[PDB]
Design an enzyme around this catalytic site. Structure first.
Site, mmCIF file in Angstrom:
data_model
loop_
_atom_site.group_PDB
_atom_site.id
_atom_site.type_symbol
_atom_site.label_atom_id
_atom_site.label_comp_id
_atom_site.label_asym_id
_atom_site.label_seq_id
_atom_site.Cartn_x
_atom_site.Cartn_y
_atom_site.Cartn_z
ATOM 1 N N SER A 43 1.077 -30.726 0.518
ATOM 2 C CA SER A 43 0.376 -31.261 1.680
ATOM 3 C C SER A 43 -0.604 -30.298 2.318
ATOM 4 O O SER A 43 -1.355 -30.736 3.192
ATOM 5 C CB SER A 43 1.362 -31.719 2.758
ATOM 6 O OG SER A 43 1.920 -32.964 2.382
ATOM 7 N N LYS A 46 -4.146 -31.547 2.570
ATOM 8 C CA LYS A 46 -4.630 -32.498 3.569
ATOM 9 C C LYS A 46 -5.667 -31.875 4.481
ATOM 10 O O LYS A 46 -6.508 -32.594 5.030
ATOM 11 C CB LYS A 46 -3.455 -33.046 4.378
ATOM 12 C CG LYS A 46 -2.538 -33.933 3.516
ATOM 13 C CD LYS A 46 -1.243 -34.338 4.211
ATOM 14 C CE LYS A 46 -0.438 -35.206 3.239
ATOM 15 N NZ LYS A 46 0.995 -35.284 3.566
ATOM 16 N N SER A 103 1.828 -34.843 8.489
ATOM 17 C CA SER A 103 1.873 -34.816 7.030
ATOM 18 C C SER A 103 2.046 -36.223 6.460
ATOM 19 O O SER A 103 2.708 -36.432 5.445
ATOM 20 C CB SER A 103 2.963 -33.869 6.526
ATOM 21 O OG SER A 103 2.483 -33.149 5.397
ATOM 22 N N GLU A 139 -1.499 -39.072 -3.159
ATOM 23 C CA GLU A 139 -0.089 -39.028 -2.779
ATOM 24 C C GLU A 139 0.661 -40.190 -3.421
ATOM 25 O O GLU A 139 0.138 -41.306 -3.483
ATOM 26 C CB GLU A 139 0.085 -39.110 -1.260
ATOM 27 C CG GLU A 139 -0.504 -37.952 -0.483
ATOM 28 C CD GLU A 139 0.296 -36.681 -0.631
ATOM 29 O OE1 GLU A 139 1.343 -36.707 -1.308
ATOM 30 O OE2 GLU A 139 -0.125 -35.649 -0.065
ATOM 31 N N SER A 210 5.139 -29.245 1.156
ATOM 32 C CA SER A 210 6.373 -29.130 0.404
ATOM 33 C C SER A 210 6.301 -30.092 -0.765
ATOM 34 O O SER A 210 5.534 -31.062 -0.767
ATOM 35 C CB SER A 210 7.609 -29.395 1.270
ATOM 36 O OG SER A 210 7.655 -30.746 1.663
#
Length: 260
Positions: A43, A46, A103, A139, A210
């Site tokens: 993440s 992002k 996230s 994702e 993560s």
């Protein structure tokens, strides 16, 4: 150096692979540990998607207020904010904030779509001089963190330099940069990572990440009291596919760096 001995010892005690890049903007000195090795971004990617949309808004002045539908089919594995708006809309500003501060993976996928796919996020990295960052997937599959897989990786050195340019430099316009900084400073997921190793008086803006293989990441801009800001990137990944996250390692890395 002394810090690199302690980071190496921290890495040995952890059983994983640790990557650290620090930039001290007071003299542009850098501290690197595995600084040129690739790590899965998870993440932390992002930030690049949000920044790319901010860059588009320098020309499309109203872009951040554009409503984007959230449909049930858009939801992936972790959508804390998007789930609150299913069958409604969120603006690109709200999606960027959700991606960064919570996230939210649906928010990230909408940002990727806005940019024309992962290739559009990577393009933005290239446009600001980051030849290392690569986003290949959406994702949630970008988090597979398979050892040796170059997809969806960057290096600590590259991410630190890019995060510096986005937040403290002028890769973005002034209004866009301030918005990015405000978003990072309001992150809700970072309390146990870099922030936990730093004096409580320092202001931190960070983005955690993560993924599989116990991948545990945090990238941060740090404003110490009465001192020039620092950019700190801490990546960590492990040999076992089911390994648990190790945010404590990032906290300890930050504490070791803060000692200097």
């Amino acid at each position: 150096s002394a810090v690199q001995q302690k980071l190496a010892a921290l890495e040995k005690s952890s059983g994983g692979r640790l990557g650290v890049a620090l930039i001290d903007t007071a003299d542009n000195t850098q501290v690197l540990y595995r600084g040129d090795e690739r790590f899965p971004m998870c993440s932390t990617s992002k930030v690049m998607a949000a920044a790319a949309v901010l860059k588009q808004s320098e020309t499309q002045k109203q872009l951040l207020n554009q409503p984007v539908e959230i449909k049930p089919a858009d939801l992936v594995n972790y959508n804390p904010i998007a789930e609150k708006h299913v069958n409604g809309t969120m603006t690109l500003a709200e999606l960027s904030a959700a991606a960064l501060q919570y996230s939210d993976n649906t928010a990230m996928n909408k940002l990727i779509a806005q940019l024309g796919g992962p290739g559009g996020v990577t393009a933005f990295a290239r446009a600001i001089g980051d030849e290392t960052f690569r986003l290949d997937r959406t994702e949630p599959t970008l988090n597979t963190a398979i050892p040796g897989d170059p997809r969806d990786t960057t290096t600590p050195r590259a991410m630190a330099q890019t995060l510096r340019q986005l937040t403290l430099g002028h890769a973005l316009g002034e209004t866009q940069r301030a918005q990015l900084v405000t978003w990072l400073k309001g992150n809700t997921t970072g309390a146990a990572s870099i922030r936990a190793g730093l004096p409580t008086s320092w202001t931190v803006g960070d983005k955690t990440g993560s993924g599989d293989y116990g991948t545990t990441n945090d990238i941060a801009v740090i404003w110490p009291q009465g001192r020039a800001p620092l950019v700190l990137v801490t990546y960590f990944t492990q040999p076992q596919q089911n390994a648990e996250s190790r945010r404590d390692v990032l906290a300890s890395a930050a504490r070791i760096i803060a000692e200097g």
